[PDB]
């Protein structure tokens, strides 16, 4: 009754068992300053998924090389990480997946890919620009700063076709 | 009286190795002890074992090469799913690479590695590393 009940949801963010550790806390502030993260919840989502992917590689470790399940899952797990551009394309092995750190997940951010493209020359300005949707991924305007661009779309990401740089109309201060 | 004979003998073998004695006399002898000793001799943790046959239970004289850390019995002889034999090794044996859990299978008494090689579960006689 009410298929709204049938819709599901998941916990994507994991809090530290030890809440107050001064060395870990300060490092999280560095990550938050360097990658322009909003709150430590932001970091938790990335930390959780790094853990699960590495855990999947460890589950595959206890399987024999080329096991029907090991080969099928192994191909897919490696494929998604280099498909997103997170893991070294050439390695494609479980051991290389084990070394991945949340910095890779932070690098996939659309707001991160802008500071490398020199569009906003500031993670905090990239965040600001994405909020005004002045950056478009290949014909898709994005208001969300964690688009997680797949490797191919780095060429596509550019200033939006809507008024901004090379403007469609009047943007911002010229408009106002 | 003696309900487990393997355990009593293996404890003696470990006790002799502690005081650095090569030759041990095991007072009770059994086919399971015989097979357990044969597997250890193959893996070279023990040397030649000579059974002095008597008109009773039999005694075994075992020459030790000084290369066994520890042996043991699992009582009762549990039933192990072939899939979960790894869990038994992870806890009882140190390191996946070194150490032998000795099993019994309808095919025969066999090594945990051999049990994995044909994926057949069984009962654990004991363990040696």
């Amino acid at each position: 009754p009410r298929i709204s009940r049938h819709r599901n949801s998941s916990k994507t963010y994991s809090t530290p068992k030890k809440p107050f550790t001064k060395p870990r806390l300060d490092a999280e502030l560095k990550l938050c300053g360097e990658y322009g993260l909003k709150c430590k919840r932001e970091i938790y989502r990335a930390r959780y998924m790094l853990a699960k992917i590495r855990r999947t590689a460890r589950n595959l470790l206890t399987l024999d090389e080329n096991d029907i399940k090991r080969r099928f899952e192994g191909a897919a797990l490696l494929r998604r990480l280099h498909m997103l551009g997170i893991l070294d394309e050439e390695k494609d092995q479980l051991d290389y997946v084990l070394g991945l750190r949340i910095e890779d997940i932070f690098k996939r951010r659309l707001q991160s890919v802008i500071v490398e493209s020199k569009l906003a020359k500031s993670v905090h300005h990239a965040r600001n620009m994405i909020k005004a949707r002045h950056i478009s991924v290949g014909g898709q305007i994005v208001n969300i700063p964690s688009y997680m661009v797949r490797i191919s779309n780095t060429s596509r990401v550019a200033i939006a076709d809507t008024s901004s740089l090379a403007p469609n109309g009047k943007p911002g201060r010229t408009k106002r | 009286v003696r309900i487990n004979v393997l355990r009593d003998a293996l404890k003696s073998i470990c006790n002799a190795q502690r005081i650095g004695k090569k030759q041990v006399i095991v007072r009770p002898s059994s086919k399971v002890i015989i097979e357990f000793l044969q597997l250890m001799q193959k893996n070279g943790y023990i040397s030649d074992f000579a059974v002095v046959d008597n008109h009773r239970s039999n005694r075994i004289v075992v020459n030790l090469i000084g290369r066994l850390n520890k042996a043991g019995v699992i009582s009762p002889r549990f039933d192990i799913p072939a899939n979960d034999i790894e869990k038994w090794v992870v806890n009882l044996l140190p390191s996946r690479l070194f150490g032998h859990i000795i099993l019994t299978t309808s095919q025969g008494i066999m090594d945990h590695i051999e049990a994995q090689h044909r994926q057949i579960g069984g009962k654990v006689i004991g363990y040696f590393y």
Binding site: D26, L29, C32, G33, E34, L37, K38, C39, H124, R127 | -
Partner: protein, 67 residues
């Protein structure tokens, strides 16, 4: 008359003087707050590091913030 009890209800809360809040500007709530806390510690290393870091609330570190 040391116990006081129900007759001493209130007491130090009622006796206390009221010192006013000093008017302050808002903080940059947002990732910006994380950005500015980072510029307080890891970037600059002057506000906390008098030669070496002294801790966020050290008395020497105060007054260098005008406090």
């Amino acid at each position: 008359r040391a116990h006081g009890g129900l007759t001493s209800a209130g007491k130090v809360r009622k006796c206390t003087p009221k010192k006013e809040k000093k008017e302050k500007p808002r903080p940059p709530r947002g990732r910006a707050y994380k950005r500015l806390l980072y510029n307080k510690n890891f970037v600059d290393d002057t506000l906390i590091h008098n030669g070496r870091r002294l801790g966020p609330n050290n008395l020497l570190i105060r007054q260098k913030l005008g406090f």
